[PDB]
Design a protein around this ligand. Structure first.
Ligand code: MG
Lengths: 180, 5
């Protein structure tokens, strides 16, 4: 069946927004970095590796606002043993109603696709914020593209997107504004 | 790969 259960009472009337993790909200690496925001131990083949995570500028303000404007859902092509701890440390305000990982993506011709139709929401009221266009090849008309982030601390894309999301949260059909 | 491919 569907990836998500019915939307909770207070969320039922909100637009559902799937938010990507890597290169969208944070950037991680196995190469030690002094200014990492999070260091997370990830076990692979019995060996514990340390992953250094950097937060994208304004992500906290971004997640807090989005959390109250939409029914936010984390959808990533990364493994839970990596992404679950990051989301635990990152999402302080419980903006994420659900979290979906690699196993929930559809592997289609070399790419892990975020197939929005498996979500179980009315696509007229669903949006995806992902840095990789290949992620939403099945629903390019629900996409609110955002540039890939790695470490540019001068980035302000998340901050500047809020006005747009503020407007979308009001419409009753995202296609009406996203062309479809 | 643990992160997004
Ligand atoms: Mg990504």
């Amino acid at each position: 069946q569907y990836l998500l259960p019915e939307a909770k009472a207070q969320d039922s009337d909100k637009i559902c927004v799937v938010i990507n993790l890597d290169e969208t909200l944070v950037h991680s690496s196995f190469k030690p970095v002094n200014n990492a925001d999070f260091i997370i131990p990830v076990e692979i083949d019995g060996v514990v590796h340390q992953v250094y995570v950097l937060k994208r500028p304004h992500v906290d303000e971004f997640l807090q606002r989005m959390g109250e404007l939409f029914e936010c859902v984390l959808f990533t092509a990364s493994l839970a043993k990596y992404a679950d701890p990051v989301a635990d440390l990152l999402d302080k305000w419980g903006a994420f109603r659900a979290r979906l990982f690699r196993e929930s993506c559809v592997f289609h011709r070399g790419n892990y696709v975020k197939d929005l139709s498996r979500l179980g929401r009315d696509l007229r009221r669903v949006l995806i914020l992902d840095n990789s266009p290949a992620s939403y090849v099945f629903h390019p008309d629900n996409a609110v593209p955002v540039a890939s982030w790695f470490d540019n601390m001068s980035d302000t894309e998340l901050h500047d997107l809020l006005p747009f999301f503020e407007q979308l949260s009001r419409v009753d059909d995202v296609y009406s504004v996203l062309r479809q | 790969s643990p992160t997004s491919p």
